[PDB]
Design a protein around this nucleic acid. Structure first.
Ligand SMILES: [K+]
Ligand SMILES: [K+]
Ligand SMILES: [K+]
Ligand SMILES: [K+]
Ligand SMILES: [K+]
Ligand SMILES: [K+]
Ligand SMILES: [K+]
Ligand SMILES: [K+]
Ligand SMILES: [K+]
Ligand SMILES: [K+]
Ligand SMILES: [Mg+2]
Ligand SMILES: [Mg+2]
Ligand SMILES: [Mg+2]
Ligand SMILES: [Mg+2]
Ligand SMILES: [Mg+2]
Ligand SMILES: [Mg+2]
Ligand SMILES: [Mg+2]
Ligand SMILES: [Mg+2]
Ligand SMILES: [Mg+2]
Ligand SMILES: [Mg+2]
Ligand SMILES: [Mg+2]
Ligand SMILES: [Mg+2]
Ligand SMILES: [Mg+2]
Ligand SMILES: [Mg+2]
Ligand SMILES: [Mg+2]
Ligand SMILES: [Mg+2]
Ligand SMILES: [Mg+2]
Ligand SMILES: [Mg+2]
Ligand SMILES: [Mg+2]
Ligand SMILES: [Mg+2]
Ligand SMILES: [Mg+2]
Ligand SMILES: [Mg+2]
Ligand SMILES: [Mg+2]
Ligand SMILES: [Mg+2]
Ligand SMILES: [Mg+2]
Ligand SMILES: [Mg+2]
Ligand SMILES: [Mg+2]
Ligand SMILES: [Mg+2]
Ligand SMILES: [Mg+2]
Ligand SMILES: [Mg+2]
Ligand SMILES: [Mg+2]
Ligand SMILES: [Mg+2]
Ligand SMILES: [Mg+2]
Ligand SMILES: [Mg+2]
Ligand SMILES: [Mg+2]
Ligand SMILES: [Mg+2]
Ligand SMILES: [Mg+2]
Ligand SMILES: [Mg+2]
Ligand SMILES: [Mg+2]
Ligand SMILES: [Mg+2]
Ligand SMILES: [Mg+2]
Lengths: 58, 135, 85
RNA sequence: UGGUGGCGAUAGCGAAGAGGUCACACCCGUUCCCAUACCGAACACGGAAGUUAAGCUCUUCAGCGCCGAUGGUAGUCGGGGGUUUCCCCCUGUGAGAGUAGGACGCCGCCAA
RNA sequence: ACUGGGGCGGUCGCCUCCUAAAAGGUAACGGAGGCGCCCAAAGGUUCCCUCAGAAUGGUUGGAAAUCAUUCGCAGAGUGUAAAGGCACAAGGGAGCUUGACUGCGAGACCUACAAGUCGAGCAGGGACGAAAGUCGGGCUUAGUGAUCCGGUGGUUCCGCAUGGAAGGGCCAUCGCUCAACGGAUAAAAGCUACCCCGGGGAUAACAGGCUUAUCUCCCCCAAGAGUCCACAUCGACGGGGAGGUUUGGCACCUCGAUGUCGGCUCAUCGCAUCCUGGGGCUGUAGUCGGUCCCAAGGGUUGGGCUGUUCGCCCAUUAAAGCGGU
RNA sequence: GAGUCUUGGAGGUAGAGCACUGAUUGGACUAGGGGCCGGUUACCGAAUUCAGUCAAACUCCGAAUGCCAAUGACUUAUCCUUGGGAGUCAGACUGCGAGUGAUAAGAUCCGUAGUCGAAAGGGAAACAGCCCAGACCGCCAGCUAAGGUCCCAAAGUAUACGUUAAGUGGAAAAGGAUGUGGAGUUGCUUAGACAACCGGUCGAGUGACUCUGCGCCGAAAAUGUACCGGGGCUAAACGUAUCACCGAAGCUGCGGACUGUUC
RNA sequence: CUACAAGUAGUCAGAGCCCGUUAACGGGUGAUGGCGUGCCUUUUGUAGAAUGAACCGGCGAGUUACGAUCUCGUGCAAGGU
């Protein structure tokens, strides 16, 4: 169980708390993708910035 | 002209007028009534105009309830002063009216007469209103 | 350009804020002496191993873990329990 | 039963009953210790003629108080929109009131 | 000094509440109040206790004095403002006392610093209590002021060759409405249109901008007035707008200069039309008018008074428009 | 150190409520007072009671969030101390929560997030602060964002079903109206309605009410059309849905430079 | 190259004409098309209808001494000078 998480929207103009969450997923650049283990921790991060990211389930 | 006999504080925050009316959304004493569709301050001067308009058309027959009371004071500064140097002096009294509030109720006249009495009163008020019945 | 005279306010005073309230979290480890709660009166009561100072400050009398807990129906206390040793 | 605890009145009020050999009371005295801003009322010391009337103990009850969901609604974090004193939409969250309901005590230890 | 320009008025430190957006913090010349103490018990401790108010009865005695009963989460009290607390009381009473102690102090809170706050516990010597124990002022949070300088008391400290002394140090303590309360000096008010320099469009006066309370104009409802009749005409109580010519609000351009009222000269634009053109309604017989609609083509006087704009007046005129630039 | 999940906690806002304080409406009810004879009344009335409103400085209640922690987990790379060196102490607007103001101001003053400041690129005609998005250089490559696709002007004169007739779109309110679309309730009607025409004659509907979509009037300012950027548009407008495409200095591709880390 | 054009004067695109170099995917000119409000100072914000400079040239502003302190370097080191 793994998630491809892609940053679709810029973090420019977004609250710091959302920016931090995005960066903590390892997303440093628009359209970057990162892979993480599907769990409640990551799902919650995604929930907090769902408007900024896109999620494929591997 | 309605105003409170005394008040705890003569100068109050204006506050805000979000949300529907907490209470008084049904005709409760009368048979008929006029309901607010919009929020506004209603001054005691507007309540007296509305009261008279409906009462005259009923010929002082029947019975009118005034469900709003203008308890909230409002201040104004004197004409032409600069900003600051303390809050302005008490000027008048308002009732805060949110959508859904039944403002007046009427009993002891026909529905035709009630409708007309309340129509006349509506034109004195700064809000849109709907005629309502009890259930 | 004319300028209307203006009055004055008789208000404009307030005391320094006193930084009251909780100073340690429920479940946090404290050392003896640590102020747990600053208050006027007993909004919160001293529980186990907790003291009430002259100005109603609640403080830990031992080292241990802070527990805020319901004290009967209406009231609250704060206690400090020793660590498992 | 009596003592002594713990538990948010689900323990409480109120109402109607039942009980006393022992135990707990009321009760009967003021010599003594002790006592009352006056009073043996109380506190204190002593007693056992009387009595369950009251306290106390045990039943029953939902009038008051208490506890109390589910659903809905208000509000609201985040994201959008608009006709922007304010309003609407979407993924979450979610009261207060109201109500279904619970409830006229539950759990120790000691002594007899 | 602050200051919705400055002056003038008000304020300046501390405490409590609200604003303050359910930690803490949080501004305004925002909304409300207090303080510059008091108490030798109104402090400590031991023991005992329960308040407001009401009803009913009762000499003087009433609405209300003291007495009695009943009901009575407090509707009282808590030295004092408020808030938070407080009825196993932090409220009330009584006995004995002086812990309203000396040396301190793990550790915390608060905090730019300076300060400010809480503190178990240890030692000394006590108060109350049979004991357990409580006590380093008061239910809590205001009741205060740095340093320098000086005074007073104490002192196993220093003492300019030595002994003293003078004088200093240390500990205790006193002297500030230094209240502009982090206190410039021990010691301090005005005028400048005779003014000057450095700066500022950080900040006022003109004009512009935003706003539109005020102002001008237009509306809605229709109570009344109009013999009758709301709507010819007028339109109260109330309600909704437009305009941006008024007085202002704000302080955004301009203070290394945006000349500032009126008039003169020259206009040009808007239309909410003064006249002339065309109309509807009329409480329009006619002649006159009233009111509303269309219409901006052209027109729209000369004098007296006043710096005047304006206004009043004289005499005319078809008319003697209102505004913008 | 930080993010997120989980768990615990402090706290009284939004909401709500009336248990307290204060305000307040109607009914029942009268103590008492006032007119009127110790006697009576449409005159007011405390308490009590039933029902009903409201509150920054009310609370029997009470969130969402935010905050403080603990606990591992998944992720991320910060964090602390000491020392050297600064600059800053005029902020602006936007959104949201308040005050002041008139619930005016491109106003003022806080709180909170963003952007500008100190940020170029695309969009919003032009336009610090709005929407999209962060420019190390080069390329006559590609994919997208906001915003768009008739012509100016790159890309749909796209598809489907509706709406609007006002150039609404492309500035405005109370209020006024047989505008028009969609729902729904209902009176009456071949025992002949409604209209017309001497209660009777004549042949199918006719009249209210509610809700809602889109329009209409209300709507007058000064150099010149003069809130669509223009042309022009009856869709090239609006709503819903779908798919293509255009579109940035975003991202990718290819080449080059430098910094950092790891090896 | 230029007499139908609306210009912070360039820039990128680009024919035509004229040349021929430190020989380079060259040089001059520039019809026409796209984009584009100087520089500086001071500001919340300046194309600014704020400030400064006519142009060109020259000259024209964190220095030195003595102390202090920190980093780095070197010598020696419980010593150093
Ligand atoms: K001002
Ligand atoms: K005492
Ligand atoms: K001062
Ligand atoms: K001028
Ligand atoms: K109008
Ligand atoms: K000036
Ligand atoms: K803001
Ligand atoms: K149009
Ligand atoms: K060009
Ligand atoms: K100038
Ligand atoms: Mg003026
Ligand atoms: Mg004290
Ligand atoms: Mg509930
Ligand atoms: Mg000054
Ligand atoms: Mg002033
Ligand atoms: Mg003065
Ligand atoms: Mg908060
Ligand atoms: Mg707070
Ligand atoms: Mg001195
Ligand atoms: Mg000597
Ligand atoms: Mg000072
Ligand atoms: Mg000073
Ligand atoms: Mg003179
Ligand atoms: Mg002279
Ligand atoms: Mg000068
Ligand atoms: Mg300015
Ligand atoms: Mg001005
Ligand atoms: Mg100007
Ligand atoms: Mg300003
Ligand atoms: Mg100049
Ligand atoms: Mg006209
Ligand atoms: Mg509220
Ligand atoms: Mg600010
Ligand atoms: Mg501003
Ligand atoms: Mg700057
Ligand atoms: Mg930045
Ligand atoms: Mg930019
Ligand atoms: Mg552009
Ligand atoms: Mg700039
Ligand atoms: Mg094209
Ligand atoms: Mg239009
Ligand atoms: Mg494409
Ligand atoms: Mg590109
Ligand atoms: Mg890039
Ligand atoms: Mg590369
Ligand atoms: Mg031509
Ligand atoms: Mg030519
Ligand atoms: Mg041009
Ligand atoms: Mg400026
Ligand atoms: Mg200058
Ligand atoms: Mg010059």
């Amino acid at each position: 169980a793994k998630l491809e998480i892609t940053l679709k929207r810029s973090v420019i103009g977004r609250p710091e708390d959302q920016r931090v969450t995005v960066r903590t997923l390892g997303l440093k650049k628009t359209n970057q993708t990162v892979v993480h283990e599907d769990n409640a921790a990551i799902r919650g991060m995604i929930n907090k910035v769902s408007h900024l990211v896109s999620v494929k389930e591997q | 002209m309605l105003l409170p006999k005394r008040v705890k504080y003569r100068r109050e925050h204006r506050g805000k007028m979000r949300g529907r009316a907490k209470g008084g959304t049904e005709v409760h004493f009368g048979e008929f009534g006029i309901q607010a569709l919009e929020a506004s301050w209603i001054t005691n001067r507007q309540i007296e105009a509305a009261r008279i308009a409906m009462t005259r058309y009923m010929k002082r027959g029947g019975k009118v309830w005034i469900k709003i009371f203008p308890s909230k004071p409002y201040t104004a500064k004197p004409l032409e002063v600069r900003m600051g140097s303390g809050k302005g002096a008490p000027e008048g009294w308002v009732a805060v009216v949110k959508p859904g509030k039944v403002l007046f109720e009427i009993s002891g006249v026909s529905e035709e007469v009630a409708r007309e009495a309340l129509r006349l009163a509506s034109h004195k008020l700064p809000i849109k209103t709907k005629f309502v019945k009890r259930e | 350009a004319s300028k209307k005279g203006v009055g004055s306010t008789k208000n404009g005073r307030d005391s320094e804020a006193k930084r009251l309230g909780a100073k340690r979290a429920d479940g946090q480890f404290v050392t003896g002496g640590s102020i747990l709660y600053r208050q006027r009166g007993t909004k919160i009561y001293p529980g186990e191993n907790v003291g009430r100072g002259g100005d109603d400050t609640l403080f830990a009398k031992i080292d241990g873990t802070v527990k805020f807990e319901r004290f009967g129906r209406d009231r609250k206390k704060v206690s400090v329990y020793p660590v498992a040793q």
